[PDB]
């Protein structure tokens, strides 16, 4: 899938984007790859933080759906107008799709100063599309209209101005040069978000010993459009307590653990070995099995002297496996078989003593009971 390798770029903390073209003649736009939402939405009018935007009037193939869409979330919102147009991904498959597009005409706290992207590609399912599930998402259109197999995979690599990060979005298959070792799969629990089930969490090999329902309260999702590992309140608190203890040899301000303040060390002296590894055990395809993905401090301390923000934060909407978990790994969104695969990434972080890992099986009792009953 050689022409698709290295087709993602971004700035640390501001997401990964892919170049796309919209309309005829093609308008080039950078689009954030977001497995946590399901709309294809593009800035369509001027904005302080947008260096270009989609101009429907310049496109001979635009069709207006005469329908508005409002997408409030927090910390923000966007609104716009629905239509269809022809869409292609230059460093993607060699196809062109007529896709729904939300042309964003007003927004608050959505576009990001300096991020270099002008729209979002929601890769999750129709159930969470706005205004409702009848607005076919981009990937659904791509699969229906072209032969492309119903699967994509993401290799996010990450790590003055914020550091540039890179990676690859492989549409339609699995590129075996982007990973090493075995691919382990966890089931997609429900096709809305990419919802999965975490059955155990360890911090430096010590079980947090919570009821596993706590890890998925109210859901756990894999989300390339969120930077941090976000954990439900009780789990977050348990985790930081444990990380504090392992690293207690040093002391950092409260704002660092709140992910607000940076912590800096003389360049090159970053004391990685005082921070523990974190293992998340995901439910396997076999009911009583799991496998673990182990992440290093190189993933959960985000570069911003060498300066870092702690990139684990509290959630009130369940666990979010964001970019800093995904950067460990090659992640396969196997929609056709309703499962998500993980393997150690050719661009994983590691030092001479430790490395990200994907290991299994571990046998674990009653993990169907680790979910939330809708
Ligand atoms: N839109 C939308 C949307 C539609 C449906 C569900 N969730 C959405 N969110 C959730 C909050 C963020 O988390 C994710 N994954 N994407 C969001 C996002 C992305 C980029 C950015 F700059 C700002 C953002 F808030 C938008």
- 194 three-class SS: strand
Query: 239 — phi, psi (to 5°)?
Result: -60, -50
Question: Is residue 223 in contact with ligand 1, taking CB distance under 6 Å?
Answer: yes
Total domains present in the chain: 2
Which of 148, 169, 187 is the C-terminal boundary of a domain? 148
Experimental method for this entry? X-ray
Give the bridge partners for 99, in sequence order: 85
| Residue whose C-alpha is closest to residue 191's, from 137, 128, 121 | 128
Which of 93, 116, 148 terminates a domain? The answer is: 148
Please work out whether the CB of residue 71 comes within 6 Å of at least one atom of ligand 1.
yes
Q: Are residues 138 and 153 in the same domain?
A: no
Is 133 catalytic? The answer is no
DSSP class per residue in 248-263 = TTS---HHHHTT-S-E
Does 351 lie in the same domain as 247?
Answer: yes
Could you say which of 148, 182, 201 is where a domain stops? 148
Q: What resolution does the deposited structure have, in angstroms? A: 1.7
Burial of 336 (0-12, 13-18, 19+ CB in 10 A): exposed
Cα 161 to chain center, whole Å? 22
Shared domain check, 68 and 163: no
Instruction: Determine the structural domain holding residue 159 and report its residue range.
Output: 149-374
Marked catalytic residue, from 85, 140, 223, 334:
223
Do 184 and 174 share a structural domain? Answer: yes
Measured CA to CA, the distance from residue 61 to residue 331 in angstroms comes to 34
**Of all atoms in ligand 1, which is nearest to the CA of residue 39?**
4
* 183/144 same-domain check: no
Dist. CA 147–CA 97, nearest whole Å: 11
Verify cis geometry, omega within 30 degrees of 0, for the bond prior to 348.
Answer: no
Known catalytic residue: 34? yes
Look at ligand 1, atom 2, and give the residue with the nearest C-alpha.
37
- The answer to whether residue 210 is domain-embedded is yes
What is the C-alpha separation between 232 and 30, in angstroms, rounded? 32
**55 with 156, same domain?**
no
- Please indicate, yes or no, whether residues 144 and 156 belong to a single structural domain of this protein: no
Looking at residue 21, which CATH number applies to its domain?
A: 2.40.70.10
Ligand 1, from 11, 14, 18, 73: best to mutate by most atoms within 8 Å of Cβ? 73
Q: State the distance from the centre of ligand 1 to the C-alpha of 78, rounded, in angstroms.
A: 10
- Do residue 138 and residue 164 come from a single domain? no
| CA torsion through residues 251, 255, 258, 259, sign | negative
For residue 36, report the distance from its CA to the centre of ligand 1, in Å.
7
63/83 same-domain check: yes
Q: Are residues 144 and 173 in the same domain?
A: no
Quick one: 34 and 118 in the same domain? yes
CA pair distance 218, 234, nearest whole angstrom: 12
| Contact indicator for 323, 226 with CB cutoff of 8 Å | yes
């Amino acid at each position: 899938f050689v022409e698709m390798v290295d087709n993602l770029r971004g700035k640390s903390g501001q997401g990964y984007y892919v170049e796309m073209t919209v309309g005829s003649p093609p308008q080039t736009l950078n689009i954030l790859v977001d497995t946590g939402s399901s709309n294809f939405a593009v800035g369509a009018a001027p904005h302080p933080f947008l260096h270009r935007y989609y101009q429907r009037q310049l496109s001979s193939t635009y069709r207006d759906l005469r329908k508005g869409v409002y997408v409030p979330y927090t910390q923000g919102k966007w609104e716009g107008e629905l239509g269809t147009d022809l869409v292609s991904i230059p460093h993607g498959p060699n196809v062109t799709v007529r896709a729904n597009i939300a042309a964003i005409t007003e927004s608050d706290k959505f576009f990001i100063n300096g991020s270099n992207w002008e729209g979002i590609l929601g890769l999750a399912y129709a159930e969470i599309a706005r205004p409702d599930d009848s607005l076919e998402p981009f990937f659904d259109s791509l699969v229906k209209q072209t032969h492309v197999p119903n699967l994509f995979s993401l290799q996010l690599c990450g790590a003055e101005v914020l550091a540039s990060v890179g990676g690859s979005m492989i549409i339609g298959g699995i590129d075996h040069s982007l990973y090493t070792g075995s691919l382990w799969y966890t089931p997609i629990r429900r096709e809305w978000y990419y919802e999965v089930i975490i059955v155990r969490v360890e911090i430096n090999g010590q079980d947090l010993k919570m009821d596993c329902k706590e890890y998925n309260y109210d859901k756990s999702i894999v989300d390339s459009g969120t930077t941090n590992l976000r954990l439900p309140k009780k789990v977050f608190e348990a985790a930081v307590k444990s990380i504090k203890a392992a690293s207690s040899t040093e002391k950092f301000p409260d704002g660092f653990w709140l992910g607000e303040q940076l912590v800096c060390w003389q360049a090159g002296t970053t004391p990685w070995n005082i921070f523990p590894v974190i293992s998340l055990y995901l439910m396997g395809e076999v009911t009583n099995q799991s496998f673990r993905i182990t992440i290093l401090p190189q993933q959960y301390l985000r570069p911003v002297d060498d300066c870092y923000k702690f990139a684990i934060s509290q959630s009130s909407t369940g666990t979010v496996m964001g970019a800093v978990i995904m950067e460990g790994f090659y992640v396969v969104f196997d929609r056709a078989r309703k499962r998500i695969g993980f393997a150690v990434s050719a661009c994983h972080v590691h030092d001479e003593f430790r490395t990200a890992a994907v290991e299994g099986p571990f046998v674990t009792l009653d993990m169907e009971d680790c979910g939330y009953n809708i």
